[model samples]
Target chain A: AASGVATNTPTANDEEYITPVTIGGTTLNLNFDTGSADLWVFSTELPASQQSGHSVYNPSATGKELSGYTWSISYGDGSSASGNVFTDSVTVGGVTAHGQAVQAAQQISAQFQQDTNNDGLLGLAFSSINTVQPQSQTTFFDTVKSSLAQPLFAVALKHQQPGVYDFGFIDSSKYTGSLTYTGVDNSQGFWSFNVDSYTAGSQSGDGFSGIADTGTTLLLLDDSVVSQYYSQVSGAQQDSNAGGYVFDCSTNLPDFSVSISGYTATVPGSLINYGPSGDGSTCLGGIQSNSGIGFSIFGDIFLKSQYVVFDSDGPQLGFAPQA
Target chain B: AASGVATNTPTANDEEYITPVTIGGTTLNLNFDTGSADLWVFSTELPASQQSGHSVYNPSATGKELSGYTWSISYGDGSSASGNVFTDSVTVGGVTAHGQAVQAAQQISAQFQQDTNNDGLLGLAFSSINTVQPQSQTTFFDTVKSSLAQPLFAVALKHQQPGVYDFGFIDSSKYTGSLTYTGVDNSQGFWSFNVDSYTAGSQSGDGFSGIADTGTTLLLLDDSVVSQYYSQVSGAQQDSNAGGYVFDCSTNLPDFSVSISGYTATVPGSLINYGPSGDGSTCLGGIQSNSGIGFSIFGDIFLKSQYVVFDSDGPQLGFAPQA
Candidate 1:
């Protein structure tokens, strides 16, 4: 069955930002999510209209039959959506994943509807779900794996700078250096690799494992290690303006470096400017301040600049010096 | 327009959690959501066997009929569900919001069917649409406000150390003295208030303004001000963590005091334990230890102990610090 879009737009508030995408051929929009998995799109043809945020789907308009499979999705903040499934074409780049499983919307709210981006998703992570709603749903990557040229894909998102995003494969012909493959840990969807050492002031931890999550935008460090790290950086000042943490942009930043299993790279100074200290100094764009310091989620900002690969089999992760 | 449940015998996984909910003397299983705004129950019937986490609802057996209104729901994660609407006596926390609009699923994933709780969501946050797929739906709070209790409807999260959450009006009946109100700026639902004075350390500029979002879990701080706060807390210790600022939990933590327009409330030491410690005391928890911090979202964590009141018309915020 073909799925059609009614109203697909992008939205953002002061805190959060949303982007739209047209999954495959479906005109439905989805928030460009960095948190979880699944690249889902919805149809305007749905069962009900009275739902507070309900969207309409007229399957007959597209001469497609909306699947009777009803589904519901809930998130961390306490909101949910429910709908059915249908087989439709999904396109990314120039190619399309045909007859893919896309969600058809029966209902949605105006607030959710106005979020920036298509009424669908383009999840970029290395994980698979045995189910979808509660916790497990097949991810877009997994679905497209068999049909893809290389068993993997590389995302090139130039956030805030106005650049095209490259998904599915790193077109060596289209870009510069050879793509570095970071072996991934197959167990968890997170790209996992070994951390030889991390230094923070006098505190240093050796042999640590970590994951790269696009959802989160910070590097969560061990408390003791972080304390020491902050100690050495001369002007590691907190943002008097923003919440979370940030240092004096004028401070000479310490070398925040990390060596992958086989790759060695330095966390750039631009990356360390995690606050709104963007005065065209060493601290650059996107790397602003955040609220909390917890589990570090390496978002597209970090991922885009790094040459890494996620080996879903061993679930091992690998990274190499940027070429 | 009788809304009820459906029985879809599907396997349950870790992702979905469910509980039993009763409406009009009819009991059916529903998906328990802490994400979206509205509450909905599906009508699609399934075989009698129940999935481990899936909720069971037999609309046919209960003789429930659709309200003939089409509705839709969106998850915070950007997924959606849609179907017909129904109206029935809904019960949550022993209080029912009569004639509440719910989704009746003709076909949904096993996730909804296998859940064990109420049929759908009980959103607990300020009204934001991004929860729904399109990111435009009004929250259940906004939609069902009139139907709910006067002043405010309290949310007692039974999880996370069993905390009772209060909204609308401070349940002084449940707690001690005067209700604290941190009047809001009314711009974007931010928990903003005038600062009494920079007591702990010293600073200039307005302390903070805006509606504190309970939905966003982290507390964002400005770059300049937060630096001063941390400097005094840590004394000459530059924040070395990727995100600056850390306090030695083992040490005697002075009340990180901030004076609102009228009162001065020292965020206690125990409360100081909210963020992850840089000294092995806790994981980054309090303010998200990140490089980018901005408009702080006083999430449920900060709201846990205190009784917070948000008035739309007054565009004001009231906070009675928790004991």
Candidate 2:
């Protein structure tokens, strides 16, 4: 079966993750997210001020597009971008997708402007959620799926080291035990799945769902769940000045476990201890409230603990313990 | 990869469907459910009163037990069963699952006792939800998955006709176009997926999730969505006396569409016009509300619209238009 693997290296202690992707002969480190559609990148069309340090995808070099159609999107974290769409050769690992939609960002929000490490985003969600105007576009995986031996992909996110993203086939050596699968509901886009139950020490809570969002930095949970999760940690409090929950830097944090199917993805205490906050002594908790947005987000902090499978075939989401 | 196929025949106007399964040399008609765990069948141990018409599983013929460990369960529909566990050779289609945990129903609720056609249940959901005491046993699929070439299964349900369930492989011939995948969250042990949005005529409503269930008979949706759906039909309204909404049998019913991923599974009007009601003049609506349960259930009426792929690999759920 046809398959490919890409290496994803962590950035600055995993503040933002990047993967090398080749588009129109230009290699750029793009943030891969299953949460949204529209593969956009910083482009040469922007002024030198915005294009200086980033690798820009110049449409004139190898790609072209029709006039009038534009794409723009805003993220949960208040980050936003607007761009024009172009069809180009996009390759991840060794799998090449030709004439794929490559959105070129002409404008970006302040949050995106300050993040020099993230060049752009590669969406792995359904194309229905693509922000392009006139008509929507298919995703890179959707374009390449028919050619692949098996329509599937896997994401391995490590805490601090380089992780692997394999396409077309699953690597048995990467995970231990059996892969636990759950059905996805893509009505709202994103790789959305339901969470069974969550354990914060001796307390257990239910009635929440999460999306597999590699685009986000931390685990954004439901308000009550977030409070209960941090309750297990000593000196944890909701500090608006710190932007969310803050705790003692040296607190002996317990493992956070989210049950899916029969398996549990246990995020180690070390991963949840998200280092010191702007307040200096208080540490930022990895799990925060999504109440502001009215949903839950399982970002890098949650994904890094398990081996994930994004199956285009079943459109299912699977997870297992890393081997 | 090792794969198997079973034909599910409709029984009593598709009220309770049954599939043939050869368990320890005795071929029995069993109800297959992805919503719950614990495979149990009518056995010789049942009192003659309960064992009269049904084919019984004789442990003396080719099965054994864990002695002290037993299982007892109650379903959402108020049906209940209690039995002892037995290890038996189970064969569905052609694939034989060796030493599968087959629960023998020693006691059954009134609802089950009246269902003479259903010999027992063949659970395909996660074993973690198994109800056996002391130790939870694995499901027939879980026991046979590792031996299969691929860890997946596909279900093709039909109205008033025989359906097919394929294990370990997807049959492209059964469906048309691309299979829209959605990640599943099985934290609750059902093929639970999300529903992005739903449509009633040209009107759209949001805020709901769904579980892909073969065990349930009707389409259970949110209360408001159901009310909106029936409002389009003439003389359709909530009837406290009839138990649910009822309408004129001759009314032209519109299609109901629910979003999965990029695609939408549209429930044809023919399927939604669920035959004449008990009162005779009004027709029964196939779609009901899960307001009583707090979540939606996409049962047989909704599932028969598409060829469904349940991939254990992604642990995802996929749907496509029937070929």
Candidate 3:
């Protein structure tokens, strides 16, 4: 019968969204990754060089070691982290989950070490897929949902601004117009939803299924759609060295929008300019190819334009334009 | 009668705290500086190279140009910025100030240029010190205080985590123990206050006057106090190239405390370690020399350890340990 609000923030270039979570008593800036379901952190168990510039969890101080238990995760980006497991008190916003399983990393790939803006990941996905061995554990949400006023959570992700993850209740003031609800498919262990249709610049097409992934930086679609979106731009090119579509910074990008449950969510042209490509020439596009993945990815580039709600009733998703 | 919460975040090394402010609908990460009285930002007027990694404000879009009006400001750390002025709608958290005077930078010192984590500064000092020529303007607070439930703002700056600036009302939940009140000296256009006494390591001494400066990154005190504090550390030396006192990162720092109005606020030794001295060989001490300044500075190093309140009624300051 309680509600909470966790402040969410974006890192440089809005590369990823980070939120604060308190494990035991130490607060850490963690990436709220819904694409995965393993809560982990840099810990005292890691090498000192790897621990530099990070807030590390000390299991010795506040956690109960889960004897002989361990977890290893390999993300789609080829980044990986692995370590021992423990149970500790975890709090997000003001919602506390007592004795929540925590993965304290002893080894992390070079990719994670370079990610200085974030300390670790607090995954909010289907708990059935938690990576802990011997026995999987429930997510922070799953552990705390029973006491919440409603078994639901909502996210308001803004571009280069402070956002919020509201639990148990929705603050209507955070959005405009009627909130539209859409069905979600959790069979894939993600908050996957389907879009009725989409409009990218002057191109319109039927929508496909995608996961609402806060951990991802770009909106990734099928190769055909990705190529379709960039074709509208005057000087757009698929630059190999730059890793994706690169266009001049001065280019006026087209707005991309999706129709879901009769509600239209629009991503402005400016939001589509994800900043410089870092190759000393041209800017990187927000929408990229999801490669050969079966579904698209509704990442921060798209999420920043709307208020999204993940409800447990029908395991549904709600969308509304942010105020 | 309303209250709003602006999420505050710390950059690497907690060098400075930044909060998001919306100007003409564009959100910029700005430092809430209480040490000066001019709100300035990087702008489209700056040279392309200077604007390389910054968010620039375009007076042409959402601003009404203030013809012939110019403003300039220099800070304690030698950082400087100056430019023409404009009036635009500005919003912090949910508090909005219509037609707020905005100083868009045309020139800035290298110090400001190197601070890439921040886009600009939102001054919270007394408006009397506003540097606009021909005519001065009110601060964002002064312009909107009448619409708030109370003419006050409280800050809860955390260590490596998201904090908040609460406007209009005191969120007692943010702090614990008694909320001690102290008189403020605004004659110099600052939230200046006095401390009864201070303890550094094993030494204790009478206190001195200082300003509660959120813009500053360290606890800058007189040469005597700074030297005295570092003297307790073995092998601690003033490193010229590093620009401050440096010691082994492994050295345990002494706890620093100041007594104000029968309230004792302490800064943990861990925080006093600051971080690596960019010099790469040692760590920088958080307590540093103010280089013979008129008064000491209760900057982020000290502020992060406690909850601070800036109340306009009597122009008083309240302090309590952060909850």
Ranking by TM-score: 2, 3, 1
TM-score of chain B of each: 0.58, 0.96, 0.97
Native contacts conserved, per model: 0.06, 0.00, 0.00
In model 3 chain B, where is the ten-residue run with the lowest total lDDT? B72-81
Model 3 Cα displacement at B9 (Å)?
Answer: 62
RMSD of 3: 25.8
Compared with the true structure, all predictions reach lDDT values of: 0.44, 0.82, 0.87
Models 1 onward score TM values of 0.41, 0.51, 0.50
Tens digit of per-residue lDDT, candidate 1, span B6-122: 122211211222344576566665443333344555444333443234453444443344322344544423434455445555554444556544555544455445444435554
Residues A93-175, candidate 1: write the lDDT tens digits: 44456655565555554544554333445455543422132223355556666666555544333324322333434444333
Misplaced by over 4 Å in model 2 are A1-323, B239-242
Candidate 1 TM-score, true structure as reference:
0.41
Q: Find the candidate with the highest lDDT and give its number.
A: 3
How much is the lDDT of residue A268 in candidate 3?
96
Model 2 clashes, total count: 15
CAPRI class of candidate 1: incorrect
> What residue runs in model 3 are displaced by over 4 Å at the alpha carbon?
B1-323
Whole-structure CA lDDT of model 2: 0.82
